[PDB]
Amino acid sequence: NPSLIRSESWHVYDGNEANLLDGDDNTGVWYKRSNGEASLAGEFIGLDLGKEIKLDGIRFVIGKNGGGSSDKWNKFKLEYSLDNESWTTIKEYDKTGAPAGKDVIEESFETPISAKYIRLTNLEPRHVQLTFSEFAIVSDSQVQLVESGGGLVQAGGSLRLSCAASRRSSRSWAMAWFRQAPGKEREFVAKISGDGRLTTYGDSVKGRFTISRDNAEYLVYLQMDSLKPEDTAVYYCAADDNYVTASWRSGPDYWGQGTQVTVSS
Amino acid sequence: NPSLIRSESWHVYDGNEANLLDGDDNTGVWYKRSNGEASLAGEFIGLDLGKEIKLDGIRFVIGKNGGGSSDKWNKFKLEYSLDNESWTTIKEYDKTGAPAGKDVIEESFETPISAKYIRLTNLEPRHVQLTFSEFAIVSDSQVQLVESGGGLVQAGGSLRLSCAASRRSSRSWAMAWFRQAPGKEREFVAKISGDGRLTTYGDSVKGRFTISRDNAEYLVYLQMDSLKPEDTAVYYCAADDNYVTASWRSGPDYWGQGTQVTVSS
Amino acid sequence: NPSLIRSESWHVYDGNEANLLDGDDNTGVWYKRSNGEASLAGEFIGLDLGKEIKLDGIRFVIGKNGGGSSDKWNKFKLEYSLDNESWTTIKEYDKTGAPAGKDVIEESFETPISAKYIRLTNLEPRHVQLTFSEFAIVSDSQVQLVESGGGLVQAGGSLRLSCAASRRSSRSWAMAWFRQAPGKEREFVAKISGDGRLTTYGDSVKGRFTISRDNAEYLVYLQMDSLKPEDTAVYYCAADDNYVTASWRSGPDYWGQGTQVTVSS
Amino acid sequence: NPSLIRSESWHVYDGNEANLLDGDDNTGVWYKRSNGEASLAGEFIGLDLGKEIKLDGIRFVIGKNGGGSSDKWNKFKLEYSLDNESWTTIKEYDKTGAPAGKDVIEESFETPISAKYIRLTNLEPRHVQLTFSEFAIVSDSQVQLVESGGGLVQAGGSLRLSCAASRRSSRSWAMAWFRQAPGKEREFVAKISGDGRLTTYGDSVKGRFTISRDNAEYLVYLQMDSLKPEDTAVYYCAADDNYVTASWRSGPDYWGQGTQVTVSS
Amino acid sequence: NPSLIRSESWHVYDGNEANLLDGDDNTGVWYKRSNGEASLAGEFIGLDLGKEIKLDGIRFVIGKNGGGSSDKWNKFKLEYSLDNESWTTIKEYDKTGAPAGKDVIEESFETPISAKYIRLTNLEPRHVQLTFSEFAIVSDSQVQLVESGGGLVQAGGSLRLSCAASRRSSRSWAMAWFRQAPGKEREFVAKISGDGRLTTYGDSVKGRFTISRDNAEYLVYLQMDSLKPEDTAVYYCAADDNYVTASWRSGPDYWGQGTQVTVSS
Amino acid sequence: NPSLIRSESWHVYDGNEANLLDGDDNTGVWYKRSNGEASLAGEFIGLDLGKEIKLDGIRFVIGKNGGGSSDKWNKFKLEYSLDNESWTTIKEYDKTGAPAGKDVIEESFETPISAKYIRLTNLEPRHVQLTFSEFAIVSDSQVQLVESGGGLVQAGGSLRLSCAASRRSSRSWAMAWFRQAPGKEREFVAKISGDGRLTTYGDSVKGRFTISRDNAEYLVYLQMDSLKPEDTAVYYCAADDNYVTASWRSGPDYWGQGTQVTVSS
Amino acid sequence: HHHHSNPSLIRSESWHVYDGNEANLLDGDDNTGVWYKRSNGEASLAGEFIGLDLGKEIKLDGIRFVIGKNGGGSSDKWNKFKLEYSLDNESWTTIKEYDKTGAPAGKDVIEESFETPISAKYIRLTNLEPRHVQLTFSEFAIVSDSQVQLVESGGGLVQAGGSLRLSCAASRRSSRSWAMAWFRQAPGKEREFVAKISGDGRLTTYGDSVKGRFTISRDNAEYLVYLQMDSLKPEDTAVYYCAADDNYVTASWRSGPDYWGQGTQVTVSS
Ligand SMILES: CN(Cc1cnc2nc(N)nc(N)c2n1)c1ccc(C(=O)N[C@@H](CCC(=O)O)C(=O)O)cc1
Ligand SMILES: CN(Cc1cnc2nc(N)nc(N)c2n1)c1ccc(C(=O)N[C@@H](CCC(=O)O)C(=O)O)cc1
Ligand SMILES: CN(Cc1cnc2nc(N)nc(N)c2n1)c1ccc(C(=O)N[C@@H](CCC(=O)O)C(=O)O)cc1
Ligand SMILES: CN(Cc1cnc2nc(N)nc(N)c2n1)c1ccc(C(=O)N[C@@H](CCC(=O)O)C(=O)O)cc1
Ligand SMILES: CN(Cc1cnc2nc(N)nc(N)c2n1)c1ccc(C(=O)N[C@@H](CCC(=O)O)C(=O)O)cc1
Ligand code: NA
Ligand code: NA
Ligand code: NA
Ligand code: NA
Ligand code: NA
Ligand code: NA
Ligand code: NA
Ligand code: NA
Ligand code: NA
Ligand code: NA
Ligand code: NA
Ligand code: NA
Ligand code: NA
Ligand code: NA
């Protein structure tokens, strides 16, 4: 019975992985990444077949329901292996430009390939939070902003976060990053105007951190360089219709749940 | 004039640091600790005096009013310093076995010592949740459960949590730990009987986590070893008059506000 | 003007029964009991108002500033009488689980109550040593161990004794009973470990005596069955940090002041 | 017309038997016993109805006014007879724990009962000095010390004495027994300390005689074993506010009026 | 597949016990009791599960339709077992004062419970006549007077009977008990008025038997003390709209079916 | 009848293990230890008594005579066993800062203990050279300089050495270490002023080894790091009245007898 | 009137018994003995002596003096000294000289043989150079066929402008390091801080009442503590005490110390 294998750096954010092996194209999973937002080349997801078998084709469904932010990889391969060490490329893909949403990857093997594992592997870095719906073989109430990237980092390092959304608004929004360290008040960290042209920074981070967004892909990014331990905190991303009020706790009309960042000495 | 200095990994669960300077013995702070409940040795709390000065004595009140869980260090030292790099012991205390509650620590310096900083520093690890009431120099209630510890630790590491109480019941309670990731439901994790003799675990945490209690100190503990990303959640600790019903979301008659563990990758 | 009335078989261990009517909530009385530790059903404490009056309510404070062993009844009733032979319940209470200490009992009678006497009366046997603080109506610093239950019993009879502490230690003690007839040496009787899981009994009493502890309420007990007049003696309870040494006059670090037990024939 | 009947071995001390039949709950009779202080199985008190008649209830007040020493049986039965030789039981009782003072026993019978006789009969030996206030059917300042037990006894046998008190004290009192043969002195027999921990005896009695006290019930006892004809005398009980002075004649502050003991050859 | 189990001291009056397992709330079973009417602590009714299995919940429906006499325990507890020797409590219940008739007890084990046996068990003597309607698990007309109590007893013993009814009259009745030895004629034993204020007895049970009624519960009781062999008989309970004629064979308009009582030497 | 038993890492320097069993406080034994001078926690010395027996006390003399160097553990425990596998603590001693000399550990076991073994066991490490005098149950000459450490360690490691002395001079001595391989010359290793403020090391060793001394305790130590086979030799400690002549074969006025060090590959 | 009298003990006048009594010096028991303090300076000066008065002139085959005394404690013996005798008590001929420098504390036996007898009326030990120790002794014969203790010695009386050295010795020797300190308590007044020194001797402090006049020192090898007092003054009068603390900081407070001497009286006239 086929089980799911995938890059260890991903955490499940919504949904659960059983959804991926269930036959429904409308159940899915949304993944944050653990140490920095961008999916590296090398990263993979796909399935362990239990034992060597003779595949007549496959049907993997990547991305998920919703308008929302781009959710798939750009350049990837479909590869199968017998020893989980050595892999063999069946097909390269370029989905650069693809709209957000389910994409059905349905491949057909005229000549039944024989393999114990089969997966998709990223080929180039990809700054977007990945979602997926279904993975199988052929053997004949609202809106959420979501932050991602973020874990343990060494003093003086860099780490980068990303905010994505489940639906695409028809208006422009100012986006902002705040942080809260335990038992303290939520601080302002940075904001950016809807069109990207105006940005300001809290005093603590000026120089080190950089905010930015990509509207085509529908994500916002915070780059933290030269980190310190007093940077430890949960980081929230927030959406405000008014750039002037975007750097005030009582400004953002929409908040993410936050991603925890710790910097050790 | 004088300001408080204390350990950087503590944070305030209740009341606030001005209570510890207000001149009044019944205004306190109750601290929690980030990344492990236990208070390591080297941990400290005391005064930054402002400038080099002739001290005739100190009166520190440690522990805070109430007959709940144990709120004091066991073995600690009172030391002072001019530069805040080098410290000198005035005294050493062994308060092992002291009942919870205020402890007035009063000293005269027959010989006017001269310091800029003076504090209590911890000598052996303490698995309680520290409270405090006053810190001076001389110179010429409905029941609340509280989880502590919790922070971010990387996959495969360990973290331990504790749950204190603000009042001590004359009945005997089962205790449990639940967890709840955002959006998922609240899972049962581990329960323990009144007398610590019986315990049971949930399938996923079975054999990685251990639950214990120390009734004389009135704390419950949770040791998590071999941590996984799927362990990330808010951990709540709960009490229930019935060991059977304690593993059920509706068993407990009391709950903590929770603490956050995150496992990175 | 109104005066106190209570079960006869109690006697004052500490405080005075003036403190009961004195107006002050910090003055109380600590009570041992005579022929057996446990307060039985039927036992009472209350006022005789010295004539029939109209009552708007009562305020009885029970327990007494405590941070030690349970000092209250569990199930009692509040009742009044005209002639002292008929008693009519006004309210029944169930304080099972109550932390030790003051408990204010304040009642208002929308229509007045015509009463000559009014009291708390206990409904279920209780194994604790009772304390009390104040009894009004409305119209317009270091440790003690106390033993209780001592008195006089016919040969072949039974007696139960208990021992309470005034303060509750953060460390675990083994507890032991000893006895000492006048002019004789003090002879070990029984010992129980911290967690009550280990017990051993002096050669003289094996088979007739049981030692037990309830840690939640902070009491130790000695049940004496099949007594004979050789058992007559002052009975002491004591605590030793070490169980091994608990059965030797010099092990213990704190001693009770003992209750006399006398077996006639 | 109905007259009183009761155990022969008793005999009046205070008031007289006509107060027991006067309609008044506040007049009574206080009995001493002879040939032992304790009242035994079968001892009884009740009414000779004169002639055989029908009853709808009874009302017996037992004990006498005042919160002195305990004064009622513990376990007794209410029984009646036509012929006076054999008896049938109605209710049984357990007044163990009862306060001292009047206790009313109002019974009404669903079926009328006819009888020449009806009484209360003791079921279990009771070491107390018996009082009674009133006996009726239905047909539609200074304290005071008392010695009881003892009259005539064959040499080398045993006899038990008790001493009751009429008021009860806030304070603790050493209690002593003294005897006085006509013609001679008041010889000290035995004292006991307030708590009952300390006792001393006259050399004439040491090892044959035991003093003991029941501070609950409020009574002191002298158990006397293997008596000699020179033990003959008036035995008295006294109270001294100081145990040290309690074996001297001018020590006791309160003195009973003595009870005759006589040991024939 | 699951089998019923219940107290051995019960026998069925009406109903088939498979009714308790059909999954229908409107088909039930009325039980008589074997030795005396009153259900004692520890009695029980529940399921033999066949082998050890894992429950998610249970649904038990106690009492039976018809607003007759009360038909359920007051205090009782749901408990389970692995072996039939040992029982763990899931839930204690207080239904004091609940009205006659079915009552669905539904419970849900949020984590499964492993049991082979699960039942309800009485906690306090209950003087009714128990009826029950249905027992299940989850794992992924005319009026009848009924008599009960009564089996075999030693002479001189005691035994007590009850009469229940299946429907409640708005008219108020006199009740009476009658016995008949076989061949021998039906003999009057005792009667009671509707308000219980009036009673009379058959000549031979004079003094030894007591008739009584509880109208809130709708039961009548016969207490038999001091039994004789001659008391052997079937005892019938009867309703008569007129007390005067309740003692007469041709008086009572309603009759029970009888319960055998038997006295041996 | 009883045999001695001690840690294996030890060897007799003076006296023999008969003197510890001889019943003479004045005979005794002095021990060095292998592979490291210092005494590790869990090291022990005591008695095997063949059968298990009922002990009434013990009398152990630790240290032996002389006003030489410190000769006892600081923190240790008396413990017994029946199996030689698990051990129950009886007492625990803190002898920190006792004078050198013998010390009588006499314990009286008021309720007897049955053990097959009983020993003293070290708690914290102890940089001394242990001497001992007598071990009993109850049932009813110019100076010597001694070197300790010595053994066989492997390349790249670490080994420490102690020098102690049988008496203590009022003169203040420079101390030094010297080594020699068979066939070869005796070479200066390192030297320290009497007050320790002054060191100089040999050439083949500067940076690697450390010499230190504890005057209060009267010991000198040699800490060796990164040992080479070159380092194999007997090692000698020696005292010299002039720090300057102390690095010269001819200077020193008193010599050890060496302890054999052996590094291997 | 028939008598036989043994010889009798003689020693310098400055000394005074602290522990024991001198009967012990003559009782033929090595295990009894005497501890001496000195008045008017702690330190034994050259010329100080102890020995025997023989009663009349006599013929010695030898002597056996046991100096020091049963001690694991601080140093108890002179360093350089001579054995000498006299017939008149007015002049002395040296028999033997010793250099015991470096000796352990405790009893040292000095048994001496006299191949050809020496006849004398007095024979004794005499110090040869100043010794800052606190002298004990145990027996003196001829031949014819629980808890610890700190002790302050020195001073008594000395006038204005003067000088004085005090000393503290102990009956046993701890294996922990102690800070040591001096305190004075004038009559009726409170006990006052004086000076203190770290166990290792590298740190000291003096009360302002005395800084720059007094000096606190120690000899850890010998186990004694010294207090040099210069430029004195009548207001320096007090019983002086010495004390040990495990804490150099609490050392100067009237309650930090865990051991006190019974004190030595200093009195300064002008
Ligand atoms: C559940 N418990 C906390 C509790 C119990 N056992 C523990 N055991 C350990 N080891 N650690 C703990 N933190 C711990 N905590 C409680 C429960 C109630 C009250 C309390 O005040 N209870 C009720 C019941 C008493 C009443 O009737 O008033 C009350 O309101 O007083 C205090 C603590
Ligand atoms: C021994 N114990 C009494 C005690 C312990 N366990 C019990 N357990 C039961 N079941 N019943 C008891 N009566 C009982 N009593 C103690 C011991 C110390 C202190 C205490 O307050 N001691 C002071 C003195 C020293 C200190 O600070 O540690 C203290 O502060 O601890 C209180 C109670
Ligand atoms: C006699 N009574 C039984 C009855 C009455 N009082 C009691 N009182 C007590 N305490 N206990 C009882 N068991 C008890 N039982 C009755 C009488 C009639 C009906 C009844 O249902 N009768 C018919 C006919 C009478 C009518 O309804 O007009 C009907 O219509 O149902 C029920 C119960
Ligand atoms: C205070 N000290 C005296 C001491 C220490 N260092 C000194 N140093 C110098 N230079 N001069 C001194 N006079 C001096 N005196 C002490 C203190 C205690 C013990 C002693 O015997 N201590 C304890 C500790 C040993 C134990 O726990 O048994 C004991 O009871 O024996 C000895 C010397
Ligand atoms: C060299 N010294 C050993 C000594 C000195 N300081 C040390 N210091 C420390 N830290 N550690 C040591 N082991 C140590 N050992 C000695 C030397 C002689 C005597 C001694 O008994 N000397 C002779 C000879 C010198 C004399 O006493 O006149 C004697 O008479 O006893 C004692 C200890
Ligand atoms: Na799916
Ligand atoms: Na807004
Ligand atoms: Na405060
Ligand atoms: Na519950
Ligand atoms: Na009061
Ligand atoms: Na003791
Ligand atoms: Na009367
Ligand atoms: Na008197
Ligand atoms: Na049914
Ligand atoms: Na009729
Ligand atoms: Na020996
Ligand atoms: Na030399
Ligand atoms: Na001597
Ligand atoms: Na100290």
Numbering used by the authors:
A (entry chain C), B (entry chain A), C (entry chain B), D (entry chain F), E (entry chain D), F (entry chain G): 1 to 140, 174 to 298
G (entry chain E): -4 to 140, 174 to 298
Which lines from the publication concern this structure?
To this end, we prepared purified ternary complexes of several VHH-nanoCLAMP constructs with different linkers designed to favor the formation of intramolecular or intermolecular complexes. These complexes were subjected to crystallization trials and several of them produced crystals, often with multiple crystal forms. We were able to collect diffraction data sets for complexes containing nanoCLAMP3 and nanoCLAMP8 complex and solve the structure to 2.9 and 1.8 Å resolutionrespectively, using molecular replacement. Another remarkable feature of the solved structures is high conservation of the interaction mechanism. Although the variable loops of nanoCLAMP3 have very little similarity to that of nanoCLAMP8, the overall interface structure of its complex with VHH:MTX is remarkably similar. While we cannot confirm that all of the selected clones operate using the same mechanism due to the lack of high-resolution structural information, the hydrogen–deuterium exchange experiments performed on clone 5 suggest that similar parts of the molecules are involved in complex formation and that interaction mechanism is conserved across the selected clones.
Using several starting points, we evolved CID systems controlled by a therapeutic drug methotrexate. Biophysical and structural analysis of methotrexate-controlled CID system reveals the critical role played by drug-induced conformational change in ligand-controlled protein complex assembly. We chose the nanoCLAMP domain due to its small size (15 kDa), ease of recombinant production, and finally the lack of cysteine residues enabling its use in both oxidizing and reducing environments. While comparisons based on limited number of repeats must be treated with caution, the structural and biophysical analysis of the selected binders suggests that they exploit ligand-induced conformational changes in the anchor domain and do not form direct interactions with MTX.
